[PDB]
Amino acid sequence: EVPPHPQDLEFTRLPNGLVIASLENYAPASRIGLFIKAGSRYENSNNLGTSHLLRLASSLTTKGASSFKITRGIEAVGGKLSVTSTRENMAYTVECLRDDVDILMEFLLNVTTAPEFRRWEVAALQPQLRIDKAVALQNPQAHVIENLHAAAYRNALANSLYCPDYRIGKVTPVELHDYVQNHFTSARMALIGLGVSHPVLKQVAEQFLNIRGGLLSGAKAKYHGGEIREQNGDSLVHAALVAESAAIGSAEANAFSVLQHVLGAGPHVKRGSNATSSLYQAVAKGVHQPFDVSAFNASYSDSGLFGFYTISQAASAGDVIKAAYNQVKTIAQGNLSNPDVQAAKNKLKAGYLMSVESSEGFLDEVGSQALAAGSYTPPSTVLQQIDAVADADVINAAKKFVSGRKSMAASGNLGHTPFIDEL
Amino acid sequence: KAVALQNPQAHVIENLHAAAYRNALANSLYCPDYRIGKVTPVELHDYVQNHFTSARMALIGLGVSHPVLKQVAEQFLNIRGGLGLSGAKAKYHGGEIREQNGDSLVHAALVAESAAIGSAEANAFSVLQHVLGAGPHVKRGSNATS
Amino acid sequence: AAVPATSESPVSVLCRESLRGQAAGRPLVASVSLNVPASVRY
Amino acid sequence: AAVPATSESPVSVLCRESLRGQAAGRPLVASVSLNVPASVRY
Amino acid sequence: WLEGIRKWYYNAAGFNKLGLMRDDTIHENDDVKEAIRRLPENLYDDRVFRIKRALDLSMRQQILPKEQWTKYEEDKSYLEPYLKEVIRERKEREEWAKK
Amino acid sequence: RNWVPTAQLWGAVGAVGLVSAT
Amino acid sequence: TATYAQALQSVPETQVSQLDNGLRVASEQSSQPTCTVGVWIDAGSRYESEKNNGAGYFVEHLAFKGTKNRPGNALEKEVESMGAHLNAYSTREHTAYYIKALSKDLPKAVELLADIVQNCSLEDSQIEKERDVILQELQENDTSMRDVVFNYLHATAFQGTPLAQSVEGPSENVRKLSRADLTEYLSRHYKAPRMVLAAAGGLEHRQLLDLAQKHFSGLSGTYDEDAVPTLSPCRFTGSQICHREDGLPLAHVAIAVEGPGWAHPDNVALQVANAIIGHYDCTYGGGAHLSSPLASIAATNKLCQSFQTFNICYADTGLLGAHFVCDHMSIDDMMFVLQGQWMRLCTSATESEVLRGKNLLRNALVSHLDGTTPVCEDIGRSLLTYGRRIPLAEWESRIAEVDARVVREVCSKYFYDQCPAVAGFGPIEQLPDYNRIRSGMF
Amino acid sequence: SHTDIKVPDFSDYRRPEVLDSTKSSKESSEARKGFSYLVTATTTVGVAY
């Protein structure tokens, strides 16, 4: 029927650098997220894993609420408290019915501005690092993506989202306090809210999120290039080949995003043959055992990685990899139809819009935009920018990949998995 | 493996070979963790039949008579399948493997391909090694000539 | 929260159909919750 | 055999002097015995 | 004379003659056991030694030379901040347990 | 809760038991 | 900015219309520039006989492989080129085919769903190719202990009835099913009165309906009177199926009592009760402090890797219970605490734990209906199950009225001294004997 | 496939009231529990005597 609205996103930057953005959608539930420039890239070789344990410690005792209270109080109202990390940011998000946002907000503030990191609570938590990591590492993709970043960069973005085994049991209360004081500061934060009033949200930030000091510093990520091979016998080999692309936000980044969809970036039809996936069709022409391939695109504040990811039976790894590469090579040599670029743009544009239709997807996008560019760019504009990409730009992004120094990671029985210098 | 790996040198030398070669000499002297518990009786029988052959062996003896030693070899060490399933040339590749683990001390090795043992060039490398310094000569000395 | 995760953790593929979608395509993200199974995307 | 190894295994250095000789200089060798502690040289 | 009787009492109690500090003599219930578990290494190790030293003197039915007796004025509660929090946490849980 | 009504039938049982049995 | 109650009224009421052939057309309009539209059908393995069990699942493998108007990968290329997503799923009672696309592309989306639903090719060679794909998926599913244990649960709880059947069907059927079986099945089941064209997003009901009339008008509204496939009730049997396999590292156990069925009001209180006991897994941050006694005991004592309560509904029956995964030495403890918790809710649920359950349920309901796809699905499935879309404000009223008394009475009614159905798989030497499990029900 | 697993027929053991797979067994559950529990109560009475 006739929906009430649609209202507009409200945006505010406080004198201390903190950004506050919100949208009153009149939903029955509210979503609040505190986004912080505290991802693993900010760890150095002396405190690796600190942000991982920090991610697992949102429930420990704080100055205004005991560990027991945080859990019982949030559960009493049927709410949620979660922590999401990327190599660049950490997002503390809470969910609850709109009449209980005062309860959740208070717990969120206590967790992010008043954690106590009690020695005994921190010690008891160390074991969770092993469980959390083992669960994540059951996915070969996690192995490969983590190794790929370690191989591509000399620092920062090179850091894993997971605590190194040697550090489990060694992360100290002091390292946690310092990590919070160094990075959980106003100039590094963005409070985002859905189903909440902006004045209220704003007033909360002004009263409880004025945290001075810390570091808005951060060493550029130095792309290096290299390869990490993890022999482990699986019948299937997982591999990723990339080159440095572009920092998120830049125009060149949009060309890489278009190139990714030209190439093939994930299924569109359940059990389909991926008729319009350039990479998939090329590989299918030459290999006849099961396999999968997809363009890979990761964009960060000061760098980016673009290439492809492949999964194939061990004996066919080289065939699949070279075939995928040759296909990117043909694009770099100018072989690209305007229709294909149009199809690609369609996929990218629809994919983007679908990614922000859920409250969760929307919050992440706003939050990410708030920290990466201290502003909000609406869909209409994003689509325009996507349309603005030229076939020439796509061909050029492809050239950059082909001629760029590569980074590679593979895991499985690598007897037939080629080294970068054999590609 | 755990006993051997308490020595950081073992870590480093094993990784250096894995980084230097594409195959063969790239293999570790120690079983990969993922393979522990998976090495089968069949793989062991096969490895022995493939490599423990007369054309691939040398029986050496000290404090023993050569005729006796010789007769023993002739009677019990005539193993066919001989020459066995030999290997391929070791392909030097080059590269680096970094193992972050926090010890106060860093162990590192930097190398380049030199020469096969036996060749004359190998002797020059052996001399170069001693010119550079290849281990202590005096207890607690300053290594004046290293 | 109230909703259980898509996959509850503890501590497949044999066809090309079930393999499509397995290849990664974006940077990794790790999530931890109070009430929901952890996840790692990409 | 009869001779026990220099160091019996089970499952640091603070000075230059004690550190000299620690750097490897030759390829690795691994030994296993019936009667003697295992060893790894270089 | 309450403070006057206090120092008198402290010496009459006599745990100081075995070198113990008042907190070393507390009856261990679950709150106390949790508080001891929470003590930092040094406070825990010191406590262990003082108790061990006192049990040894008790077995020999002996006491320390007077110059080694814990002094009333220097005895401090090392356990209090920990035990007080443990009790607070349990009370909080008990309140929550009522609906 | 259900304890009164259950304590009351347990009540009754003891009583009738004694009465009869004794 | 509104309160929770005020926001429930913020929801755009769902619009429903019906074509002459009897097809229902329903939608929920938002401002989203994207949308989800699909067809939900009253068809599933519960409608299959032993001879064609697996047919619907087979059809699912063909649905997007080509139509008369768009043979081969043609349909595929069209969906992909406009950046849309085409999906499908089959359960024991429902089948759905849906597309995610830009709102502006709604006309083409509705045309494609219509083409798929009425002109699917079902090419002989495609059928043969899909046999092998289905056989490989059956091998893959064999490695999913959770899928195995739940199919086992249905097999014993509903033994001797259509609900005992898996959705995929037995391997022999997959090998033998013919094109004729598939067309006979589709002929008898894909009728206008058994389908719902649902859409959620930035679109108007009037446009949806016009597209319906335009593309689904020729959809059959009559197989005849000799066919009208009608479901008979399915008997529930207190029983046990134990597949012992000490070679697997963890045991999977699923236990359930017979549930009420979709349309029963009791489902709300049962959902509150299930929220009180909840779910859990080793990665939960809560630990010893979790509200659910089963979850805190489990976490502090390391009784399981995970557990989840569930309320699986079917027309006039269902499976109400829980599933857990644990070490071979913890099965008995898990079962003991789980049953103790059901028993405690029957006789002693407290007002505060019940309010907590109600709050958990409210949050789950609203957070689930987030995005066009979940809402579209709720529209399609609800019309089939309840015959209408039940609005959030109604769910709120149903939830608000549940209190400790209602929870005790409804739990007692379904759990108390009732025979459960039990399924076990893995190192289950320690799974309690059925009699012992049965005595734990009182 | 595990989907090839079907529960064997038990019709030879079933109480008559639960022989129809097209009928709800709940309709007879109270009668079936009543019968067995009656055997238990009577026994307990005889033992008390």
Sheet holding A226-231, edge to edge: A226-231, A406-412, A236-244, A303-313, A291-300
Q: Give E1-99's CATH code, choosing from 3.40.50.1370, 2.40.160.20, 1.10.1090.10, 3.40.50.2300.
A: 1.10.1090.10
Q: Quick check: B14 and B29 in contact, CB under 8 A?
A: yes
Six-digit token pair at E21? 């500090």
| B135 contacts in chain D (CB < 8 Å) | 21, 23, 25
C-alpha atoms less than 13 angstroms from C-alpha of G11 in its C-beta half-sphere = 25
Six-digit token pair at G286? 């809560």
Cα separation values, D23 from A147, B12, B132, Å: 29, 10, 13
Nearest CA in chain D to B16: D27
Q: How far is G355 from chain E (nearest CA, A)?
A: 10
**Neighbouring residues of H17: CB distance < 8 A, sequence distance ≥ 6:** H25, H27, H28, H31, H32
DSSP three-state, residue G294: helix
The residue type found at A222 is: K
| A348 contacts in chain G (CB < 8 Å) | 83
Of A91, A90, A397, A88, which is closest to residue A221 (Cα–Cα)? Answer: A88
CB contact, 8 Å: G136 with chain F?
Answer: no
C-alpha atoms less than 13 angstroms from C-alpha of B26 in its C-beta half-sphere = 22
- G211 and G319 inside one domain: no
Please give the Cα distance from G292 to A319 (Å, whole number).
53
CATH number at residue G329: 3.30.830.10
Q: Tell me which chains share at least 3 CB pairs under 8 Å with chain D.
A: B
Six-digit token pair at A234? 């699986």
Of A119, G8, A94, G424, which is closest to residue G433 (Cα–Cα)? Answer: G424
Strand runs labelled E in G314-415: 318-326
Six-digit token pair at B31? 């079983």
Backbone φ/ψ region at G359: left (φ over 0), alpha (ψ -120 to 50), beta: alpha
Contacts 24+ apart (CB under 8 A), A200-209: A200/G1, A201/A20, A201/A22, A201/A32, A202/A12, A202/A20, A204/A105, A204/A109, A205/A14, A205/A18, A205/A20, A206/A14, A208/A109, A208/A113, A209/A18, A209/A34, A209/A109, A209/A113
- Quickly list H helices, B21-102: 41-51, 66-76
Sheet holding A29-36, edge to edge: A10-13, A19-23, A189-194, A29-36, A90-97, A80-85, C29-33, C39-41
Mutate to test the interface with H, among G46, G149, G166, G235 (most CBs of H within 10 A): G235
Phi (first) and psi of residue G39, to 5 degrees: -120, 125
Please give the Cα distance from B13 to B29 (Å, whole number).
10
Q: How far is B28 from chain D (nearest CA, A)?
A: 10
Measured CA angle at A36 (ends A35, A38), to 5 deg: 145
Phi (first) and psi of residue G203, to 5 degrees: -160, 165
Residues facing A292 on adjacent strands: A311
Please give the Cα distance from A122 to A116 (Å, whole number).
10
Residue G234 CB neighbour total at 10 angstroms: 26
Phi (first) and psi of residue A228, to 5 degrees: -130, 125
Of G440, G434, G435, G398, which is closest to residue G415 (Cα–Cα)? Answer: G440
The residue type found at G166 is: S
| G351 contacts in chain E (CB < 8 Å) | 99
Please give the Cα distance from G139 to A4 (Å, whole number).
50
Going by beta carbons, is chain F in contact with chain G, meaning 3 or more pairs sit under 8 Å apart? yes
Name the one residue in this structure whose structure tokens are 């690598």: A414
CB contact, 8 Å: C6 with chain A?
Answer: no
Please give the Cα distance from G25 to D29 (Å, whole number).
77
Q: How far is C6 from chain A (nearest CA, A)?
A: 14
Please give the Cα distance from G195 to G114 (Å, whole number).
12
Sign of CA dihedral H2, H7, H8, H9: negative
- Quickly list H helices, chain B: 8-20, 41-51, 66-76, 120-132
Measured CA angle at A399 (ends A394, A400), to 5 deg: 100
Six-digit token pair at A271? 């059990």
Residue G331 CB neighbour total at 10 angstroms: 23
Please give the Cα distance from G27 to A116 (Å, whole number).
50
Cα separation values, G232 from G50, G163, G312, H25, Å: 15, 10, 18, 13
Sign of CA dihedral G135, G136, G140, G142: positive
Please give the Cα distance from A306 to A298 (Å, whole number).
6
Of A356, A359, A343, which is closest to residue A382 (Cα–Cα)? Answer: A356
- Quickly list H helices, A287-375: 317-332, 338-355, 359-373
Please give the Cα distance from A48 to A51 (Å, whole number).
8
Active centre residues of G (catalytic): 60
Residue G7 lies in a domain: no
* CA A279 to chain CA mean position, Å: 24
Please give the Cα distance from G442 to G346 (Å, whole number).
10
Please give the Cα distance from A85 to A40 (Å, whole number).
8
How was it solved? cryo-EM
Helices A338-355 and A391-403, interaxial angle, to 10°? Answer: 90
Of A348, A351, A344, which is closest to residue A278 (Cα–Cα)? Answer: A344
Q: Quick check: G384 and G315 in contact, CB under 8 A?
A: no
- G342 and G436 inside one domain: yes
DSSP three-state, residue D16: helix
**Neighbouring residues of D42: CB distance < 8 A, sequence distance ≥ 6:** B9, B13, D24, D25, D26, D27, D28, D29
Q: How far is B16 from chain A (nearest CA, A)?
A: 13
CB contact, 8 Å: B87 with chain A?
Answer: no
* CA G204 to chain CA mean position, Å: 28
DSSP state of G34: E
Cis peptide, bond prior to residue A379, ω within 30 of zero: no
Q: Quick check: B83 and B55 in contact, CB under 8 A?
A: yes
Please give the Cα distance from A230 to A10 (Å, whole number).
48
Residue A261 CB neighbour total at 10 angstroms: 28
Please give the Cα distance from G372 to G35 (Å, whole number).
6
CB contact, 8 Å: H24 with chain G?
Answer: yes
Name the one residue in this structure whose structure tokens are 């798989």: G425
Phi (first) and psi of residue A241, to 5 degrees: -125, 125
Nearest beta carbon to residue E92 from set A66, A119, A120: A66
Q: How far is F2 from chain G (nearest CA, A)?
A: 6
| G352 contacts in chain E (CB < 8 Å) | 99
* CA G195 to chain CA mean position, Å: 17
| F6 contacts in chain G (CB < 8 Å) | 347
Backbone φ/ψ region at F16: left (φ over 0), alpha (ψ -120 to 50), beta: alpha
Residue G226 CB neighbour total at 10 angstroms: 6
Six-digit token pair at D26? 């030759």
Which domain, by its residues, includes G272? 239-442
DSSP state of A409: E
Please give the Cα distance from H8 to H14 (Å, whole number).
13
Cβ separation of G151 and H2 shorter than 8 Å? yes
C-alpha atoms less than 13 angstroms from C-alpha of A145 in its C-beta half-sphere = 28
| A99 contacts in chain G (CB < 8 Å) | 3-4
Please spell the DSSP secondary structure of A246-297, one letter per residue. --TTSHHHHHHHHHHHHH--S-SBTT---TT-HHHHHHHHH--S-EEEEEEE
C–G CB contacts, 8 A cutoff, strictly below: 68
Six-digit token pair at B130? 């001693």
Please give the Cα distance from G435 to A160 (Å, whole number).
51
Q: Tell me which chains share at least 3 CB pairs under 8 Å with chain A.
A: B, C, E, G
* CA B75 to chain CA mean position, Å: 30
Of G139, G398, G103, which is closest to residue G271 (Cα–Cα)? Answer: G398
Nearest CA in chain E to G289: E93
Cβ separation of B34 and A232 shorter than 8 Å? yes
Name the one residue in this structure whose structure tokens are 């443990």: E86
CB contact, 8 Å: A219 with chain G?
Answer: no
Q: How far is E83 from chain A (nearest CA, A)?
A: 14
Of G340, G336, G342, which is closest to residue G253 (Cα–Cα)? Answer: G336
Residue G233 lies in a domain: no
Sign of CA dihedral G94, G100, G103, G108: negative
Parse chain E into domains and list their residue ranges: 1-99
Please give the Cα distance from G68 to G277 (Å, whole number).
51
Cβ separation of G359 and A97 shorter than 8 Å? yes
Q: Quick check: B15 and B99 in contact, CB under 8 A?
A: yes
Nearest beta carbon to residue C34 from set A71, A295, A305: A71
Six-digit token pair at A370? 């708030």
Number of folded domains in chain G? 2
**Neighbouring residues of C3: CB distance < 8 A, sequence distance ≥ 6:** C36, G363, G364, G367, G368
Please give the Cα distance from A229 to B19 (Å, whole number).
10
Residue B3 CB neighbour total at 10 angstroms: 14
Of G346, G358, G386, G337, which is closest to residue G271 (Cα–Cα)? Answer: G358
Q: Quick check: B79 and B54 in contact, CB under 8 A?
A: yes
Six-digit token pair at G316? 């006039």
Q: Quick check: C1 and A57 in contact, CB under 8 A?
A: no
**Neighbouring residues of E48: CB distance < 8 A, sequence distance ≥ 6:** none
Across A124-151, b (16+ Cβ under 10 Å) vs e yields: ebbebbebbbebbeebbbbbbbbbbbbb
Phi (first) and psi of residue G63, to 5 degrees: -35, -40
Burial of D8 (0-12, 13-18, 19+ CB in 10 A): exposed
DSSP three-state, residue E54: helix
Measured CA angle at G7 (ends G1, G9), to 5 deg: 135
Cβ separation of A231 and B32 shorter than 8 Å? yes
Nearest beta carbon to residue C23 from set A59, A83, A310: A310
Judging by DSSP bridges, how do beta strands G24-29 and G15-18 pair with one another?
antiparallel
Longest CA span, chain F: 32
Helices A317-332 and A391-403, interaxial angle, to 10°? Answer: 130
The residue type found at B139 is: K
| G85 contacts in chain A (CB < 8 Å) | 268-269, 354
The residue type found at G122 is: L
Six-digit token pair at G5? 């109650």
Q: CA torsion angle for G116, G118, G119, G121 (degrees, to 10)? A: 80
List D residues 4-33 in contact with B (Cβ-Cβ < 8 A): 9-11, 13, 17, 20-25, 27-30
CB contact, 8 Å: A419 with chain B?
Answer: yes
Return the CATH number of the domain spanning residue range H1-49: 1.20.5.270
